[PDB]
């Protein structure tokens, strides 16, 4: 079927009884312990079999296709805040379990009609690492990678994911990509030309001051000084998004 996600091809050839309806993707095995993770903002891994087959919860439509359809109409600010809040919830859950994505981009942010947004393809940044363009036929989007991975710094941390979630954030406000680079060196040049003037006034105009503060904190070039999902959830940007638990 339709599907081409980051590391393999996703579709639905079989099904198995009881109206299973899943997404099945073809591409150590500690990704089998990702089956034990449960969070409303994470696409649940149902099963995994090496012969390898991943079977994810089927959600069509991803944040990229939504932003593409919402290109001219834009996205309501409460919906942007809700998506960013849910993605930060998922990132905090994954980082508390020492699980990185290391290559977030809007194509692995699945959405449903209920309004929920879930992180997909997560924690498998070891099955052929993170994609890189070695051949001229390969594409590989670099628009959302943290500068430390772009350079080639070998030590990756949770701070990379935040950086990605930062870029996507700005994108949802402009449905124009923040750092649309076409090589590693051009990506670094764009990043450090933007960051080296930086309140994010001209680059994300429609975003209020709380939003620009949260964005600049999510887009610190230094990964050790980049904001965490925990601290970002406590940002005054989410003052009207936070609601008690019952």
């Amino acid at each position: 079927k339709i599907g081409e996600g980051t590391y393999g091809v996703v579709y639905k050839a079989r099904n198995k009884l009881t109206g299973e309806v899943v997404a099945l993707k073809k591409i150590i095995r500690e990704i089998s312990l990702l089956k034990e993770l449960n969070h409303p903002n994470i696409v649940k891994l149902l099963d995994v079999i090496h012969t390898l087959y991943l079977v994810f919860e089927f959600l069509h439509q991803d944040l990229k296709k939504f932003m593409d359809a919402s290109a001219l109409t834009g996205i309501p600010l409460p919906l942007i805040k809700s998506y960013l809040f849910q993605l930060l919830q998922g990132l905090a859950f994954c980082h508390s379990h020492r699980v990185l994505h290391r290559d977030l981009k809007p194509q692995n942010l699945l959405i449903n009609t209920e309004g929920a947004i879930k992180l997909a393809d997560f924690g498998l940044a070891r099955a052929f690492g993170v994609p890189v363009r070695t051949y001229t036929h390969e594409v590989v989007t670099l628009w959302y990678r943290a500068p430390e991975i772009l350079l080639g710094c070998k030590y990756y941390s949770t701070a990379v994911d935040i950086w990605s979630l930062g870029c996507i954030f700005a994108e949802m406000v402009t449905r124009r990509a923040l750092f649309p680079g076409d090589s590693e060196i051009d990506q670094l040049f764009r990043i450090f030309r933007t960051l080296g003037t930086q309140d994010f006034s001209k680059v994300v105009p429609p975003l209020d001051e709380d939003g620009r503060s949260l964005l600049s904190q999510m887009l610190h070039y230094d990964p050790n000084k980049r904001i965490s999902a925990k601290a970002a959830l406590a940002h005054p940007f989410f003052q009207d998004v936070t609601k008690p638990v019952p």
């Binding site: 439509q61 919402s70 109409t73 009609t113």
Partner: peptide
């Protein structure tokens, strides 16, 4: 939610 309605019904 109206934005979602329109997008998913598209």
């Amino acid at each position: 939610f109206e934005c979602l309605d329109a997008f998913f019904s598209c």
